Symmetry: C3
Subunit: 45 residues, 3 copies
Amino acid sequence: GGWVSGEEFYMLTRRVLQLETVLEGVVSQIDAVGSKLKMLERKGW
Amino acid sequence: GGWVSGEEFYMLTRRVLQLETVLEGVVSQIDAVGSKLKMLERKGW
Amino acid sequence: GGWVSGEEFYMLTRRVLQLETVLEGVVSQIDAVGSKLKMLERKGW
């Protein structure tokens, strides 16, 4: 169904960028949480 | 390596949509959690 | 602004793949957590 311009590709390309930037930040808080949970487990809680 | 059709671009475009929709919902639960954790901290736990 | 090649589309296409793969894994840990929270609630905590 038609051609694709670089303008819309670039546009879509940035959305993917923001997703990577936001998903990386999320994954990080989860690791930082999943690990105090671990310290708590090592401590007896 | 070749041309890109609007059909596959549109297709990819929707996957990115679902990702934004799902990632937004995730980020939200995390904020809603990261904040009772805060209420708990303000309360003494 | 120009044409889009299949090489860069394919490339972008994989980034979207990794995002789906990583986001699915995240969503899962959240469900697995959001549910012991539920078992804890059913138990009285």
